[PDB]
C-alpha cells in the first residue's frame, strides 16, 4: 500500500533559438496530476487529474509561481554548468531534476529523494539520510560545497519529510475514488507454432495499475529470464499499463513451463500454464 509524489523537470538549451525549453510534470504514484511547458500558451501550472482541479486559485498561482522559478533556476544552471565543464556555448545541453517522497501503507514518511543530472548523467544527489550529498565528478564538488554551506539538505529534508508527505496525504484523500486503487492485471496466454517442433508462449498482463509488476517464465520451476523476450511496461493510455513475456519452447514440452505474475493488486501471485 506504498505511495509517492514525484516531480520531474527537464531543461534543454536551444542556442540561437531563445531560452531553454522547460518541462515539468508532477505525479502521485503512476498518475500525472500537473504539468507546465514553457512553450505552451497558458504559462501556468495546468491540472491533469480530476481530483487536483479541486485546488483553489491560491494553489494554482502558488504552483505557477514556483514552477516558473524552477524554470529560471535551471536556465541559470545550464550556463553555470557549461563553465564548470569548460564547454562552449555552441551545443545543446540538458539539465534534469527529480525529487519526491514515499509513504508506507500507513501513509507515513518512508523516504525522500532529490537528484540532479547533466546531459543524462548523475551530477548530484541527496543521500538517503537526507543530510548529505553524493557528487559524481570534480565539477559537481562546487555545487556540493555551495549547497552544504546554504543548508540545502536541511531545507529539503524539512520539505520531504513534512510538506511532501502532508500534501501527498491530501491528494490521496481528494482522489480517493481512483488514486488509491490497485488494479490487478487481466492475464492470458497465447500459443503459436513457430515450426513443426517449436512454439511461442506469450504471457500477457493488461489493465493493471500501478505500472510496477513482475512477469517471469519458468521451466520445471527454473527461472528462464535469459530465454524470455520481455517488453518494457507500456501505458495503455487510459490510466492502466500493459506488459508481456514470451518464450519459444520445444513443441510438446509446453506443460513444463509456467508464467508467474506478481503485482500489488493480486491477493496471491499467479502461476499460469498453457492448456
Amino acid at each position: 500500500g506504498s505511495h509517492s509524489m514525484r516531480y520531474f523537470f527537464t531543461s534543454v538549451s536551444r542556442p540561437g533559438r531563445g531560452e531553454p525549453r522547460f518541462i515539468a510534470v508532477g505525479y502521485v504514484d503512476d498518475t500525472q496530476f500537473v504539468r507546465f511547458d514553457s512553450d505552451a500558451a497558458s504559462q501556468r501550472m495546468e491540472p491533469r487529474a480530476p481530483w487536483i482541479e479541486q485546488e483553489g486559485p491560491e494553489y494554482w498561482d502558488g504552483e505557477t509561481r514556483k514552477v516558473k522559478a524552477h524554470s529560471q533556476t535551471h536556465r541559470v544552471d545550464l550556463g553555470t554548468l557549461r563553465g564548470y565543464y569548460n564547454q562552449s556555448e555552441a551545443g545543446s545541453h540538458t539539465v534534469q531534476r527529480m525529487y519526491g517522497c514515499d509513504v508506507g501503507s500507513d501513509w507515513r514518511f518512508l523516504r525522500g529523494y532529490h537528484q540532479y543530472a547533466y546531459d543524462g548523467k548523475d551530477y548530484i544527489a541527496l543521500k538517503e539520510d537526507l543530510r548529505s550529498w553524493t557528487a559524481a565528478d570534480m565539477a559537481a564538488q562546487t555545487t556540493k560545497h555551495k549547497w552544504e554551506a546554504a543548508h540545502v539538505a536541511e531545507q529539503l529534508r524539512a520539505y520531504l519529510e513534512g510538506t511532501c508527505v502532508e500534501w501527498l496525504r491530501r491528494y490521496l484523500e481528494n482522489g480517493k475514488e481512483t488514486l488509491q486503487r490497485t488494479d490487478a492485471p487481466k492475464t492470458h496466454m497465447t500459443h503459436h507454432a513457430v515450426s513443426d517442433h517449436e512454439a511461442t508462449l506469450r504471457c500477457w498482463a493488461l489493465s493493471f495499475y500501478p505500472a510496477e509488476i513482475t512477469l517471469t517464465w519458468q521451466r520445471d520451476g527454473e527461472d528462464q529470464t535469459q530465454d524470455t523476450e520481455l517488453v518494457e511496461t507500456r501505458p495503455a493510455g487510459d490510466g492502466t499499463f500493459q506488459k508481456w513475456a514470451a518464450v519459444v519452447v520445444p513443441s510438446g514440452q509446453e506443460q513444463r513451463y509456467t508464467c508467474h505474475v506478481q503485482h500489488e493488486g493480486l491477493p496471491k501471485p499467479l502461476t499460469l500454464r498453457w492448456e
Binding site: 509524489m5 508532477g26 504552483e63 529560471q72 544552471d77 525529487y99 540532479y116 529539503l156
Partner: peptide, 9 residues
C-alpha cells in the same frame, strides 16, 4: 505541491 526554495548549482 512543489518545493519552494531555489538552490542554484
Amino acid at each position: 505541491f512543489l518545493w519552494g526554495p531555489r538552490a542554484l548549482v
